[PDB]
Amino acid sequence: IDLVTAELGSDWPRLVAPTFDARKAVVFDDRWASAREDLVKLWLAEEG
Amino acid sequence: IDLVTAELGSDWPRLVAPTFDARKAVVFDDRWASAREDLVKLWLAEEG
Secondary structure (H helix, E strand, C coil): CHHHHHHHCCHHHHHCCCCCCCCCCCCCCCCHHHHHHHHHHHHHHCCC | CHHHHHHHCCHHHHHCCCCCCCCCCCCCCCCHHHHHHHHHHHHHHCCC
16 A cells, blocks of 8 residues: 555545545425525515 | 555556566676677678
């Protein structure tokens, strides 16, 4: 492991560490909810 | 070391092993010796 590090360097092994996992995903399929809140904000704040 | 191997593969660490060492070098600076043996071989074997 010392020899492998000697060739590749310090940053390469540390940055190659895994990140992605299947449980952290977030899905936004709602327009219906966000469109309603979007309109009332316009309606109340109307100036121009 | 298992994670590092997982990324890079099996062949990469094995082929990257060191080879060169300063003590195995071989120097041929002699023409004077090799030219003499070269001529006598011609002289004896002359046909054409």
